[PDB]
Symmetry: none
Subunit: 332 residues, 6 copies
């Protein structure tokens, strides 16, 4: 009889444990424990907080870290950076808690100093902080500049208008660095402007049903327009969606540090009034036939660190776009 392990364990732990626990306490402490030990991320949502449902936070190898902070948060002004390994917040250990607790303790009533302690690799001691879409035409360079800090809505038309400003340009710079990512649909729609044939992405799991896929069309006005993409360790999900749609179709050269491979689809479905769960349903797969999750996407060129001259990697990207312009002028 295989239906016996859990009953015996529950009986022993509800009888002889050093403290007294009932059915409810063991059940709630087993469901969430199974959630946390089952996959990378999971969370049980209570009924009271199920009515409605700072820095962006993402686990790496089990230790909670911040992937890519934003300038709009007070923590960036405090001195937070990418790659920071979070260790303790508000005298509470962070080796075991969900992101939800982090977003409640970070976002809420202002004028509340929060004693966040973070361990950085470059220096031993944990620092303590008491914390509280875009298209440009760079000067002295006719070539356009593109900076994206997230794949929000109403961005495809903005990008089209921004690229309409300088059609004569023989190259653009893509700034996907320090990007947590965004919606897969928005990412593939944005990357549609730089490819014409093939599949932009393939979302596949283990069940053939709901294997959502996105295809290219004839609405791309910048297929042959040279591009060089800047990526780094701190780019995730939709960033690698774009950097796989481009690099897999051989329509770009990817320049920067080796990135961090993450991204999967999850959603909320109420199985009961008092039971709510979250689980990794499916993954993103790039057109080459490989997933983002395992190792990330390796740039062809790797190099580590008015305004163009202040970044060596941007200089290498400028090199690459100028070479592409040279090839275009040679053939034309």
């Amino acid at each position: 009889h295989m239906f016996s392990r859990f009953s015996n364990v529950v009986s022993e732990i509800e009888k002889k444990y050093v403290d007294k626990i009932s059915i409810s306490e063991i059940m709630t402490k087993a469901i969430e424990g199974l959630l946390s030990n089952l996959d990378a991320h999971s969370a049980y949502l209570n009924e009271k907080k199920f009515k409605e449902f700072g820095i962006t936070v993402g686990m790496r190898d089990g230790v909670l870290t911040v992937i890519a902070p934003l300038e709009g948060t007070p923590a960036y002004k405090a001195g937070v950076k990418s790659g920071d390994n979070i260790l303790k917040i508000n005298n509470e250990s962070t080796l075991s808690m969900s992101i939800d607790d982090a977003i409640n303790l970070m976002r809420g009533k202002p004028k509340t100093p929060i004693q966040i302690t973070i361990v950085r690799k470059n220096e031993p001691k944990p620092l303590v902080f008491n914390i509280i879409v875009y298209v440009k035409k760079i000067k002295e360079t006719p070539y356009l500049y593109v900076r994206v800090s997230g794949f929000d809505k109403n961005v495809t038309k903005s990008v089209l208008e921004g690229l309409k400003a300088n059609p004569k340009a023989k190259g653009i710079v893509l700034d996907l660095r320090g990007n947590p990512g965004g919606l897969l649909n928005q990412a593939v729609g944005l990357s549609n402007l730089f490819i014409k044939e093939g599949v932009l992405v393939s979302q596949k799991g283990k069940n053939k049903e709901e294997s959502l896929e996105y295809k290219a069309n004839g609405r791309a006005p910048y297929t042959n327009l040279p591009i060089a993409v800047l990526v780094n360790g701190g780019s995730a999900s939709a960033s690698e969606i774009v950097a796989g749609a481009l690099q897999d179709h051989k329509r770009a050269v990817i320049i920067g540090e080796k990135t961090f491979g993450k991204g999967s689809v999850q959603m909320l479905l109420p199985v009961n009034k008092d039971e709510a769960i979250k689980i990794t349903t499916a993954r993103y797969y790039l057109p080459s036939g490989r997933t983002i999750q395992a190792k990330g996407i390796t740039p062809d060129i790797v190099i580590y660190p008015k305004m163009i001259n202040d970044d060596i990697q941007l200089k290498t990207a400028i090199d690459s776009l100028k070479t592409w312009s040279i090839v275009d002028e040679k053939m034309d």
Copy 2:
């Protein structure tokens, strides 16, 4: 049975998950999740001590702030070459991620055939990167127990770093060899614990009346308790006892019989609060488990495990002048001897 409130989740996770995993695997994952929320030093597995019973590197691992930690390097073992020190959080062993397991797993991986190199990655307080230590195993074992006399004074300083082999008789004879000393410095540093019987026997010397240690659970039955008799020969002998982070469990019932009864003076650093006992017992027909069923306490009524033994005098570091802790302890011992002489 009332499995339903978890069987709903097992069905959902075995219906809409990325992979197709066996029911046994998800059952094991839920069991480990229950363990990882009840406590921090329990392990549930099929294979156990049925036919387990050698050697080792003499290393010790303990759970602090979610990380295993080496606490007590031993001179007898070849750890001198590796230069292992306390306060080193365990990150990786054998160049693989060892972020979150149990203490028993680390003990089992350490135990094995000797003369085998091991790679230890650990983060030290002042070093910038987790250093890699290449430590070779050995079979030579040697307990560290000795009796010495302090220079230019009748007081004695003796060293006992373990609670094995019932060293109580050796301690008694060493103390009785020179009873002239009106004070003797006892060290609990470099001794994170041992057998409770040896600890009771050692602390029996300094206490003549009252209780010594009481192991209790939430069940009144088997509320085991130890009581000191009148056999205590040194009930009048003053002492100074030094404790630090390198002491736990057995070396914390002594510093609860003395400090809480004013029989001795406690100096050093805040200790490690490992004041509970772990036992193996079966849960099913072919599965055995390791979860605690009772802790143990101090004569004052407080428990060791919850916060750890607190020294009375706190200070941080020719042997007397080498470390300021021994200097302060000798000062306390001399003052106690002077009060004894003034009374005389």
Copy 3:
């Protein structure tokens, strides 16, 4: 006839010396040639000053040194500490003269300008400096810290009322460094509050007459009150004659470094019509059977030479006094 050698020397010196000398100035240069030659503390005084009647200078092995300055004058603020070997003052060499000459040179009106040069061991160069009784509780501890400003008159009553004001019967720490000393009656009055039986000290010499001795009375209300002595090399005379009675009676443990000896008594006596002589006639002898001169008290504790944490020696004394309180609590 050894006195005839004096006649021979005085004749050979007053006849063929390269300067004109007479009986008066050969006798005066022998009176002060024998006084301040027997012991460093002896000197000559004139009856012209007899009708008339900031730092402290003690003869450390002949060479004049400074024992302890005073806060009431800017001399202490000038940076002079213990062991400061005086070499010159008022641009005149401090080769060999009595302390009275020095106190005339500097001590007097506060507006009097003084210039002193000192050859300290730490700085090879001779540094030059130009110079123009309470009871307090200890935070977090039952003990109180007591300091004496000086051994002058009417200080015993103040310390007695201060100790009686707060009924702290677990222990007190006593400070002695920085006190040059004073009269014996004040010292015995101050120390009789602690001493109950036996002889606190005995004044003795080669003469069996006037061997003044002070005996403790059974009116001491603080026999069992724990104390730890706080002394250093800057304690002498009245800070070690009565403070040695403690260690002689096993009433305390001294904390610090080896102290200094200034425990010999002297006075003035006429020798001729208008001349006076100062000679150390008798000594202080501790009840153990040994005199202070000149070793002070042998070391007890080896130590490196809000308010409590700032000094290590006070921390060690606090540790010892806490141990004494622990013994008292165990017995009680």
Copy 4:
């Protein structure tokens, strides 16, 4: 009567000078002054020197500078590097002499110990020193890096067969560093490999007759093969022909430091019945129209310094080559 000023001047110089001067010396000095103020490459050879007739010497900002040695010569033992100005040779002033004199001093028997003092920018004081054609496959990529050190015959067929051996290279990194080149014919032959049509180089003067023109015919087998040639100050004259054929026709990527504009050719001709001068009657021309002289080939990307990571020049050139290979892959 416009033929009197120079005669008056020479007569005056021969009449009222410090020393008696012959007509030969004054006329020689006047001719040498004309040569020096006329052209910077002149020489004065007599009838005896006419029958009679390693390191590189060139005139930069007036001073004579050594550009780069040859690894075949023992100069590698002497450690001769770039950025050196010859301050003295054999402890003699070298302020102002003709380049031919320095060349003659250098030329001689091999393995001759010669003292040479040079001025280096990094060093604070001048130091004195003593002087006593392969195909490589780039790692991890099918690209190749080729080198040319011997400017002799059959080098064109050797490089052609080397290129034909491994046609898999979708782009090959090139460099002209440390290569001044020799005759123009072999340089035209070498640059013909990358150019299939148009003018390659020309050699002209203000005389229309005898203006040489070299145009590459349709025998180039690598017109579509991408290249990225690296140039620096260590290349001049007969290597800048290639970097003017490629850069101005968009058939390679030119990166590095600016070159030396030694674009003219020197030859010996007789001026008098017994005297001869060595003057440049011809200069080189780039296919764009401008000349190499005095400015040199201008690199497109300008940067300054497993083996790829050692030097930033090869890293940037590899970046450009990889980008061009990606463009070629995108095309097909």
Copy 5:
């Protein structure tokens, strides 16, 4: 008389050369290239301002232009430029191939003009670039008087008659010549100190026996016994060693300082056109010992390398020599 050898060159290079030239161009080029190369101090004035309308001295140290001595009044001294520095550029033009006259004309201009000059100092690897925009002092605690000379003509002869005839207290005077470029031998009025005893002080020689001026001295200088010590350094040139030859050859002083190099030479003007002319060094100054300033200069007897007196060691040694001379005079007297 005959242009043959040069006329072959002109006829050839008028056509055969790479660029187009005319007879006037090559004539001027040959004249300039002969003048500037025949001797280091000879050049032709093509169209200079002296023809139409009518700041430091630069000396060619072994053919290279070097700073001789900046002036305190001009901002050149404030620029920090020291002697022995090889000038390499002035107003974005290389200095390696022109005469001193061009440099001095470019230096002179409207006030408040920041003329840039690049000079390669030996003490620094890189050349710094600076945008350049007689009195007697009673030294403290010393009876001696300090004489500072800003022009050599000021030291020939006036002081016996009027200068030092009113202050006989000067039993010793410090004679300094450091950084003095030179001057004329016969043109000054103000405070002209003199110490030369008698006889020949300087001579001139060459090829033309005519106008071989040799200034002489007579017994009109009663200051032949006043003790002096002379301060010289590398900054002294031309006449500054004429005096240091006169004294050191009359044994009228001992020369204290650092071995120096002078530039004693004479150039004149010979018209070649309506108003302008050319220059050439034809005669040189000769010291009474039987030698001449060029070359290698005159070696000071005492060579020492570098409250006013206490601030410099060399002046501290010169004052020692002056005191020794006073001691000798007191011993004999």
Copy 6:
């Protein structure tokens, strides 16, 4: 007896003092206390900053290689407190059988602690210059003849650099004889006391062969009073140029009165006088110009002395 003002003291010290001491010891102490207020009076020791100080070791003794320099005060000898004694005691301690191993502790100015050390006429021709530099080792007898013959060997030199450093000095007669070379008339020295009788005086005769020979003499702290006779003659009669540091002016001379077989007292019954009304004690011969430090450029003293000597020679040649 008339010593009542000392009998009173001896009675008070034999009656009311702490200890009881024999009268002979008190009498010796009284003699020593009298000998220590009228006057402050291998290796050399002298009174500076209140203590005995070493001046300069002799080249022949091992103290030369022991590293003994100037500016050293005596703190201990043989690891005993030596704060205050007479000079004669240390002199007798050092004097005796040579090659005697003995430990001396000396206070060093440029050291953090006083260290312990276990102590166990030539004429040179200056190259390229006619001038010569000479030195003097000791002021003992039969030295004048050697110096005179060395000077007469090469009289061509218009200047000689006299070296008084490293020569402590000696008897007055030797100093007068050796300084007689550079002075032809006048008084040389005067040894006088408060008694007019026995005021020995020395005057130079016409035997001087170098009356016009310019000389530069260098004196510093290393030259004691016993050698400053030459520097008091020359610097005051304008016969040489004195450069260096201030000297050690212990001018006066004492005489010995024996009190036992090996014990004696000394009193300075004789004083020195320079031929200008001055005296050596205690300022010493102040140099005219003061300086503080291929054999010339290594030091500044000889450099400045050679400069002054060359100026002297230039004035001599200008006179000729």
